[PDB]
Nucleic acid binder design. Sequence first.
DNA 1: CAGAGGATGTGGCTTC
DNA 2: GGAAGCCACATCCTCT
Lengths: 147, 101
Amino acid sequence: VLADHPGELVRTDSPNFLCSVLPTHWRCNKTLPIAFKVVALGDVPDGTLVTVMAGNDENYSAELRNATAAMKNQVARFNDLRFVGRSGRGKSFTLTITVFTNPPQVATYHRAIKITVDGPREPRGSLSFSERLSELEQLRRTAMRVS
Amino acid sequence: SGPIQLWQFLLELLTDKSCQSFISWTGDGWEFKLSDPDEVARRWGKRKNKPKMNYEKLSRGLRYYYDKNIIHKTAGKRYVYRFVCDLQSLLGYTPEELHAM
DNA sequence: CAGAGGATGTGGCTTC
DNA sequence: GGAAGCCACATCCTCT
């Protein structure tokens, strides 16, 4: 199976599981460049639930989209999994895959992906309305500065 | 001229008796119409130093406010939208008081 | 076109 | 000085 997709699978801290390689850096809420897959080396009956969670120092449990998939033929194919939550400047998320067998199994993929709002990017007394709209249009400016 | 958000810019043109030609309140709450889209589009592109700016793109920005609950569109009335945020609490003028000025 | 939204580039601007 | 983050759009596009 590794021959059909060379360099597209990677080892988890668990010897019974493999998961697709993720991009080092990726934009938040953007679709992934490679369908994310979790491969079970041992025998996992088709239909077992497999969930992934992302997190780290900043975000204990980052918000994800489509982080649940059904295991079929030792392979859980995630349908458009996306990272909504952010990992923090110069930081990465550690995925925590979890195959719900009986008992359940846990596999980790450390320092996997960094999620940011742009992702990998190309190198670069009474006052009037006018007065009120102005204060208003700045809010974020002064509000942040002064605080 | 500093940071400015579309919904705020529009709010300017709506507080400038001079613009009433292409954009004006409709008398109903904070609802308003862009009697002349292409114009507003033109000024906005200017205020943002965006020559290509037009209404097709400007209406996109307006749509991004639907979610954020800042501006909603009025069903059936072309170029008709409405401020849905609490402008009264933000500025102090009830629709009429403001409409007056 | 007008109008809803998704995908993704862009330029301002603050943070380290 | 400047790369790395955040933000609001600016572009563009498919239908209806």
